[PDB]
Amino acid sequence: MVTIRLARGGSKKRPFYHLTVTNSRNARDGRFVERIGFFNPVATGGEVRLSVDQERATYWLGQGAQPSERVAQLLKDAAKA
Amino acid sequence: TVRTLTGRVVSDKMDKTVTVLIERRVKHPIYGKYVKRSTKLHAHDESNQCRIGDLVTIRETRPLAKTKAWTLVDIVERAV
Amino acid sequence: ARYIGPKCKLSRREGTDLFLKSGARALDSKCKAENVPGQHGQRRGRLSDYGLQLREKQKVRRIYGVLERQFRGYYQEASRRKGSTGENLLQLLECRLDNVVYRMGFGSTRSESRQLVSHKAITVNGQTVNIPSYQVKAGDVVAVREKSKNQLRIAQALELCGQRGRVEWVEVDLDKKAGTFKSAPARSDLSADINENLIVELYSK
Amino acid sequence: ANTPSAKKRAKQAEKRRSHNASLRSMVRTYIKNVVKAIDAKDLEKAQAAFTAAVPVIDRMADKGIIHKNKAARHKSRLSGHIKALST
RNA sequence: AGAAUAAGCACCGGCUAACUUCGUGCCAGCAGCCGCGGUAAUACGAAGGGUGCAAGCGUUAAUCGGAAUUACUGGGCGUAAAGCGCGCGUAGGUGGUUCAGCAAGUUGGAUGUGAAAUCCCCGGGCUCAACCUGGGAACUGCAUCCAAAACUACUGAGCUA
RNA sequence: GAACUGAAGAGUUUGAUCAUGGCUCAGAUUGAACGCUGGCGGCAGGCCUAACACAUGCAAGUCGAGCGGAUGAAGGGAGCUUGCUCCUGGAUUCAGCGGCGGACGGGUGAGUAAUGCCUAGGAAUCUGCCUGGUAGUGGGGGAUAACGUCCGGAAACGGGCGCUAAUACCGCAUACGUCCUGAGGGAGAAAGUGGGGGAUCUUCGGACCUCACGCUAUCAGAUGAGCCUAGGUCGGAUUAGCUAGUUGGUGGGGUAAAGGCCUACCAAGGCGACGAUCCGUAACUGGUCUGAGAGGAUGAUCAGUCACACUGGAACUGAGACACGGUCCAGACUCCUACGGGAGGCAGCAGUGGGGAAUAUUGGACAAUGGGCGAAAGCCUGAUCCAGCCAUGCCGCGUGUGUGA
Numbered sequence A: 001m002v003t004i005r006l007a008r009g010g011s012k013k014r015p016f017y018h019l020t021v022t023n024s025r026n027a028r029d030g031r032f033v034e035r036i037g038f039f040n041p042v043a044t045g046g047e048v049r050l051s052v053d054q055e056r057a058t059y060w061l062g063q064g065a066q067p068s069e070r071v072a073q074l075l076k077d078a079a080k081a
Numbered sequence B: 001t002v003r004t005l006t007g008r009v010v011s012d013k014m015d016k017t018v019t020v021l022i023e024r025r026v027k028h029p030i031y032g033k034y035v036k037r038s039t040k041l042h043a044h045d046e047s048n049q050c051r052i053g054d055l056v057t058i059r060e061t062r063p064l065a066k067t068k069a070w071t072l073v074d075i076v077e078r079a080v
Numbered sequence C: 001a002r003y004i005g006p007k008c009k010l011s012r013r014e015g016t017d018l019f020l021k022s023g024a025r026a027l028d029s030k031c032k033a034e035n036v037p038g039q040h041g042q043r044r045g046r047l048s049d050y051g052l053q054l055r056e057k058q059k060v061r062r063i064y065g066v067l068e069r070q071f072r073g074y075y076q077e078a079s080r081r082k083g084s085t086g087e088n089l090l091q092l093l094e095c096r097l098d099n100v101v102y103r104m105g106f107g108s109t110r111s112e113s114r115q116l117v118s119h120k121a122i123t124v125n126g127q128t129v130n131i132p133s134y135q136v137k138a139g140d141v142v143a144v145r146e147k148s149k150n151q152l153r154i155a156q157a158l159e160l161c162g163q164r165g166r167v168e169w170v171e172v173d174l175d176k177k178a179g180t181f182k183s184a185p186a187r188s189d190l191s192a193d194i195n196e197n198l199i200v201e202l203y204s205k
Numbered sequence D: 001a002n003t004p005s006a007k008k009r010a011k012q013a014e015k016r017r018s019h020n021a022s023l024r025s026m027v028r029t030y031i032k033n034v035v036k037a038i039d040a041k042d043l044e045k046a047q048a049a050f051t052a053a054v055p056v057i058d059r060m061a062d063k064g065i066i067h068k069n070k071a072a073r074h075k076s077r078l079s080g081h082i083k084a085l086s087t
Numbered sequence E: 001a002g003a004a005u006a007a008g009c010a011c012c013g014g015c016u017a018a019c020u021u022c023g024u025g026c027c028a029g030c031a032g033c034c035g036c037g038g039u040a041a042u043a044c045g046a047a048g049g050g051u052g053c054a055a056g057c058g059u060u061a062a063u064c065g066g067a068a069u070u071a072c073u074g075g076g077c078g079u080a081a082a083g084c085g086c087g088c089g090u091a092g093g094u095g096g097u098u099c100a101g102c103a104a105g106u107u108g109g110a111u112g113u114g115a116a117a118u119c120c121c122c123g124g125g126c127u128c129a130a131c132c133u134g135g136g137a138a139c140u141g142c143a144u145c146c147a148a149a150a151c152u153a154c155u156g157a158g159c160u161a
Numbered sequence F: 001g002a003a004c005u006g007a008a009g010a011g012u013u014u015g016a017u018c019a020u021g022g023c024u025c026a027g028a029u030u031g032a033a034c035g036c037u038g039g040c041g042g043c044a045g046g047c048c049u050a051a052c053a054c055a056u057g058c059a060a061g062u063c064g065a066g067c068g069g070a071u072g073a074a075g076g077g078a079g080c081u082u083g084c085u086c087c088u089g090g091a092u093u094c095a096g097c098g099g100c101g102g103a104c105g106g107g108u109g110a111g112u113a114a115u116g117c118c119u120a121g122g123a124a125u126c127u128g129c130c131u132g133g134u135a136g137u138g139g140g141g142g143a144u145a146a147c148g149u150c151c152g153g154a155a156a157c158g159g160g161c162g163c164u165a166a167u168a169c170c171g172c173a174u175a176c177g178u179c180c181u182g183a184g185g186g187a188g189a190a191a192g193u194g195g196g197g198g199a200u201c202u203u204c205g206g207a208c209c210u211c212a213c214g215c216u217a218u219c220a221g222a223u224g225a226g227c228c229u230a231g232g233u234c235g236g237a238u239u240a241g242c243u244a245g246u247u248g249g250u251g252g253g254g255u256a257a258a259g260g261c262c263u264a265c266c267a268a269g270g271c272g273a274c275g276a277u278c279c280g281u282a283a284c285u286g287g288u289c290u291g292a293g294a295g296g297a298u299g300a301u302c303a304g305u306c307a308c309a310c311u312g313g314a315a316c317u318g319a320g321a322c323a324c325g326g327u328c329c330a331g332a333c334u335c336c337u338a339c340g341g342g343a344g345g346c347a348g349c350a351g352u353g354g355g356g357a358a359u360a361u362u363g364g365a366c367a368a369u370g371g372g373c374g375a376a377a378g379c380c381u382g383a384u385c386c387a388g389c390c391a392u393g394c395c396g397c398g399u400g401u402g403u404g405a
């Protein structure tokens, strides 16, 4: 199916993640159709931990896209805020 | 609103088909002067009403044969 | 890296101010600082335009103790920055951490200021910074360690720099061994003898 | 092969081939009988062959041996030929 | 605890920043181009002394620049290379002047695209930088429509240089 | 609001001069190599040549909630005794059938000058797993693997006979959706497993109600793929003619789909100095390096598309392959053999020989992000995350400091 998961940008031992809506039969950071936001596992200073776009995510879920487990946790945590 | 293309009939010796020349003037990529290029297309003339020299307007459709995917919609000028 | 060697042979070659000693006695009565070094020293040696560019570029580099890869990076950044790159280069090169801890009066020489800054004895907001290239943003309170405030080398450097002039844009509290930078210096503030335009002429070729 | 799943897939494939071949032969047999019925210029036997051939054709189309558009095309063309023969 | 423990390479006749002596004597050797050397060589080989870069320094191979030296921007052809020996003419290029129409070129606007990254501008994080990253700008391109009619093209009717 | 703002010349033809004109130089860059020398850290990069041949080791499995079979513990009890066996039960493990995955991820650039790539479009198509609706999941049968037995073989194993299971296979039961048939009528499917339970027939064996997974027919949505048209895509004219399935039509065949895609007849058409055909060379693009710009060179890293998988062909399985560690045939080269016959494909990650001026370890773990499988624990992952060697590149810091005639 088409699924929403994490693409690993950043540098060695300094991760960064793009929340990508990709066809599941693609590479980790291969072609996609749309990007909804990002997650920063280092934060610190004025850097924001996570941000997403709500309306596009709702559209993608309304078109039946399976989010990964970590992506599901982070999106529900963001929806809490 | 069909995407037409206007042209001049060149040869029609094949049954239910017509050859149309379409002339365009393209700008040279560097020297800035326009040169007249031409394109030859084959169109489906169902009732072979197009003789040589006529000026017509065609339309894009699905392929009717190999290298024949246009159909004339109506003649707009005849020939002497 | 860094330069090691005689600190007045350079002055003799260049024949100008070229601050490289503590300045205890004078600038002159150490090395007869009017002749270029070596056997062939008395000759004035009239030199072409390329000589002019090379001589003043070496002058600025030696007074500020910067290597040439770093210096050319500085020049590229200055050219990137808008508004008359010639003085942008000086303004940006002035904001180095070691030259600030010198000009704030905490060190006898640029080399001794680098000595202090490298061995982790100076702060910016309490955070250990020991890179003698840090570009100090305006506002930061540069200070020495509360542990290091009792060292006598800082005391002697401060009393020696007590009579060297006033820059009239920083606000320095001397009791606590702290500095403060408000806004970047203007072109007129620095010594208006060496021109900046001849450098940018050198690097535009 | 090297991985045992490759061997299992292979043997299941020969089993599936030996199965599918018989049913493809059966459908081809029925349409061939129908076609030679029309080409022989007889109507009643053409009717009977068509009525006896459509059920197996459609059952096989649903079974997944052939694709449904193919079966529909066969039905339509053969019906057209017989209707043309009717006159 | 201990300054302890960690500087090399090229060059110095001009172009190009930096000179003296000793040894050979058109030999041995140098060299990117001009070129040095035959008994005081700042050019050879060494010494001292300098100049330039620096954990690197040179050398070779390759691309663009300088080269307006393939010249659209932006060159030339009497004597430096360069006008066919000379006509006629096919395709092609170019077209005196007036009135009117059309709207292909032309101009302005709207809409869709021009994947992401990279380039550019303003910020954020690692002691700074390299590096990572947010937002924006840009991607001169292409297609579809709406409006204008000065010039070119197309259509009709004229005029005489 | 900011997105740029940018352009240098010198030496050398002459006794000397001006012009023309070639050569050389000062800059920025390389996946670079060589010589002298050598302290450290961070981030990157690392067979450009022989798509030359390859030792060993690893790089795709998973499901007992699909199915028989065999492993059957702990035990509630008994016998004789202290150990075993057995009734009833029973937690684990898997050879085989079956369901998914293996067509993804990973590698290379040989071929390819256009069935490839880039830009803009359009009409005749298909699509598992995902989501949203709709209608159902009833009743039978014949086998077979494993399992015994016999023959044959060096092995892979092959063959004869007997029996068994299902979500394996095939009829039968009907058609809210569908297919064709002009209205008329006709045509076409399903598999059950796991958790509970009020009442009822009854061995709440089961029937019955619920939930979970799963299965069938269909509409739509995305996701992915197939097909068509116009424009652009290296050098050579010391390559000027090429084409007979070739160009168009009719009937039929074929594909999921338009089409000379295939076939039989009908006519002689079609392309080309706007460069057809032929020869050489070469994956294409975003982009990279230079330049004031216009341009010039180029396609290392990363991303999108294409092609290939020892060489040449062909099809089967499926939703999708002409299939990178699948099948069959032929070939070249290495190997085993009981001489009957068999085995192999590092352009997957380290490694070796060789070629070269020259490019590295036969290292760790699923800890994280993804992938496959299962409902859930969980397994597999040389993809990925980290280590090793290398001054290869960029950036940063050290080899100290003051005085000292």
Ligand SMILES: [Mg+2]
Binding pocket: C001
């Ligand atoms: Mg350095």
Ligand SMILES: [Mg+2]
Binding pocket: D059
């Ligand atoms: Mg049936």
Ligand SMILES: [Mg+2]
Binding pocket: D061, D062, D063, D064
């Ligand atoms: Mg079916």
Ligand SMILES: [Mg+2]
Binding pocket: E016, E017
């Ligand atoms: Mg000089």
Ligand SMILES: [Mg+2]
Binding pocket: none
């Ligand atoms: Mg030399």
Ligand SMILES: [Mg+2]
Binding pocket: E040
């Ligand atoms: Mg001598």
Ligand SMILES: [Mg+2]
Binding pocket: none
């Ligand atoms: Mg010498």
Ligand SMILES: [Mg+2]
Binding pocket: E067
């Ligand atoms: Mg040029």
Ligand SMILES: [Mg+2]
Binding pocket: none
């Ligand atoms: Mg050149």
Ligand SMILES: [Mg+2]
Binding pocket: E075, E076
């Ligand atoms: Mg000229």
Ligand SMILES: [Mg+2]
Binding pocket: none
């Ligand atoms: Mg002459």
Ligand SMILES: [Mg+2]
Binding pocket: none
């Ligand atoms: Mg003449």
Ligand SMILES: [Mg+2]
Binding pocket: none
């Ligand atoms: Mg002529």
Ligand SMILES: [Mg+2]
Binding pocket: E089
């Ligand atoms: Mg003439």
Ligand SMILES: [Mg+2]
Binding pocket: none
């Ligand atoms: Mg003419």
Ligand SMILES: [Mg+2]
Binding pocket: none
């Ligand atoms: Mg005119």
